[PDB]
């Protein structure tokens, strides 16, 4: 009834992620994104994928 499903998701999600997601850090500027310390840099190859 969409209550139990949301409750199950909120219970599982409290320990599902042990670290920061890599797709939510969109506040990076161009100089910090381009720098080699970024782990997302090696996964950006094509402009449409």
């Amino acid at each position: 009834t969409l209550d139990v499903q949301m409750g199950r998701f909120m219970e599982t999600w409290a320990d599902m992620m042990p670290h920061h997601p890599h797709w939510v850090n969109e506040h990076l500027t161009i100089l910090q994104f381009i720098a080699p310390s970024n782990p997302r840099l090696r996964f950006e190859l094509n402009p449409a994928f």
Binding site: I30, L31, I34, A35, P36, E44, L45, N46
Partner: protein, 98 residues
Amino acid sequence: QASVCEFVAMPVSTDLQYFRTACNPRGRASGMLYMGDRDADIEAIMFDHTQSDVAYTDRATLNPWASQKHSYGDRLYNGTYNLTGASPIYSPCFKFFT
């Protein structure tokens, strides 16, 4: 004789002061010129993005769409993979990517 122009994609927010001097179209400076420790250093200069750029020593590459090992520009213009081999027209940036 008409000279063909080859197009390389790159992000819009690109530092324009790169193109005001003698630059490299790949987005990351590279080449044979830098050695002195071993033999397998050309690939580390041209493709290893763990360490910074050799010339502009504060970043890895200006564009990440034409500089990595299997990026868009490298999958399209590198002579090893031979995507444009059936083309009878010279590619003016074949020498920068191979």
